[PDB]
Every structure is written in C-alpha cells, then in structure tokens.
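I hope you will forgive my troubling you with a question about protein structure. I am sending you one protein, given as its amino acid sequence and as whole-number tokens for its backbone shapes. Thank you for your consideration; the sequence and its tokens are set out here:
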Amino acid sequence: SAKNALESYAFNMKSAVEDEGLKGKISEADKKKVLDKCQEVISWLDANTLAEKDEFEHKRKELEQVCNPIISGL
C-alpha cells in the first residue's frame, strides 16, 4: 500500500508545517513549498491509485526532498 504510505507521509509533512506551533518553527517558504508539494502528490494519489509501487516510491522520494530542507530544521 505505497499509496497509503505516500498520502500519510505527505499528510504528515503538510500537517507538520501547517501545525499551529511548528508554523513558527519553519520558514514560510518551506512550509508553503512542502504543503503545495504535499497537495501535488495527494491530489495525484487520488488520481493514480492504480500506479505501480515504484511510482509511489519515487513520489515518496520527491515528497521527501521537498520536506527534507524543512525537516532538517525541525
């Protein structure tokens, strides 16, 4: 269930930056970029549930790279 993993992961990063406390711990730009990216994958997840595992696996890598610069300061 790489789809479930991906969406939860994207939800998690999105929730973390958009968290009412972490919202002042991360910079607006990082918060924005990861949220937008999380929305990108999340809206894609909803569209490509039939994707292969590697599609999500790569999407995970993508999402990780967007949140990574933000998570490294969180």
